[PDB]
Each structure stands twice: as structure tokens, then as C-alpha cells.
Design a protein around this ligand. Structure first.
Ligand SMILES: CCC(CC)CN(C[C@@H](O)[C@H](Cc1ccccc1)NC(=O)O[C@H]1CO[C@H]2OCC[C@H]21)S(=O)(=O)c1ccc2c(c1)CC[C@@H]2O
Lengths: 99, 99
């Protein structure tokens, strides 16, 4: 599809057997999801943006479906105010910017 | 152009007569630039990001050119980690997400 940017580019995703709403975010290198109790091992990480840093848990090789497009990669889980789909997964679903 | 996301979508912008680099950021409602001198009156504003809230200077109706495309809109100036072009200006240059 083609998504205009009048409003936030929010889409439904499926991760860990749950459906959630997430932003298609070209400004995020990687993907950051709201606190969830995912199974498996993880590594601690600190990620910075406007306002400072938050602490997140880094999970690898996590399967995510975005608008029916499957992808698998790194997911950072922590107290983010929004679910963020970053470039590491946007490349996998074929997402481009166009103007 | 069509821009892939295997690298950060960085572009050259012109604002206040100065060339800068900025990130095309679909996850940003607003455009926020690092500290700079801008010709124009301004108003104190707050904006929130992944790590909390910061104070910014809000410049309304500012001329800004993005990868050769002209926009006139609001630009926030303050301690952002990176110059970001948000949806308020992405819509002006006709930018869409496509997959
Ligand atoms: C560094 C560039 C940029 C931040 C300037 C990176 N962000 C992504 C960017 O889209 C954020 C997304 C967002 C965060 C919170 C709430 C809503 C939307 N928008 C943003 O702050 O927007 C500002 C201006 O407009 C306003 O509307 C929305 C909020 C206000 S991030 O979220 O900080 C991030 C993500 C992953 C990762 C990192 C950092 C580091 C490692 C990891 O890869």
C-alpha cells in the first residue's frame, strides 16, 4: 500500500502471538516495543532520543508480521510510550519513502 | 526520489541560508533541529520523545528546503540528538511510505 503522513503511520502488527498497533518509523534504526513478557534470552541496552535514554531488553530473531508482511529481527522491549517499527524490519517488508 | 531504508534516510536541508543534514523521520509529528541561530521570532514550547520532554524554541512559518523541495512550516529548535524532519514538513514535500 501507500501511506500518507497526514496522521501517524500506525499499523497492526503481530508479535509473540499478540496483535498491537505500531508506528512505521523511518527515524528509528531498530524496533522498540512497549513492555511485554516475551520468552527467551535477552541483552540489556540503553537507547537515546529526545529527552534522554530508556533502558530496554534486546531480543534477537523475533518474528513480527506487519500488515501481513512477515519479518524477523531484533526487537527492543522497554518503557517506550509507543510501539516503533524501525528500519531493521521496514527493509524486510519492502518499505520505501517516496516524494 | 525513492529512498530505501537499509541506511538512515539522511538528506541535505537549507534553512535560514545554511545547509544542514537531517533525518527523514516518519515517527516524528514535528520537525526538531539542533541548536542554531534562526532569523525569526519564537515561542517557548515543550516536546516529548522516547526519553522524556525537552524545552524548544518554536519558529512558525519558516522557509526550509528538503532535498530540493520547498516547505514553509513550524521548526522546533533545541537539544534533540539529531536533526529530524517530521510529518508536518514531510507532508509538504509529498512524502509517502510505500510497501
Ligand atoms: C535519534 C533519532 C530519533 C529521535 C530524535 C529516533 N526516535 C524515533 C522517532 O521517530 C521518535 C519516535 C517516537 C518516540 C516517542 C513518542 C512518539 C514517537 N519521534 C520523536 O521523537 O518525535 C518527536 C518530534 O515529533 C514529536 O512527535 C512524536 C514525538 C515527538 S526514538 O524513538 O528516539 C528511537 C527509536 C529507536 C532507537 C533509538 C531511538 C536509538 C536506538 C534505537 O534504534
Amino acid at each position: 500500500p501507500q501511506i500518507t503522513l497526514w496522521k501517524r503511520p500506525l499499523v497492526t502488527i503481530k508479535i509473540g502471538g499478540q496483535l498491537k498497533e505500531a508506528l512505521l518509523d523511518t527515524g528509528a534504526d531498530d524496533t522498540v516495543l512497549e513492555e511485554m513478557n516475551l520468552p527467551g534470552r535477552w541483552k540489556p541496552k540503553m537507547i537515546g532520543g529526545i529527552g534522554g535514554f530508556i533502558k530496554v531488553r534486546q531480543y534477537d530473531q523475533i518474528l513480527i508480521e506487519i500488515c501481513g508482511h512477515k519479518a524477523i529481527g531484533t526487537v527492543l522491549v522497554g518503557p517506550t510510550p509507543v510501539n516503533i517499527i524501525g528500519r531493521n524490519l521496514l527493509t524486510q517488508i519492502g518499505c520505501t519513502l517516496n516524494f
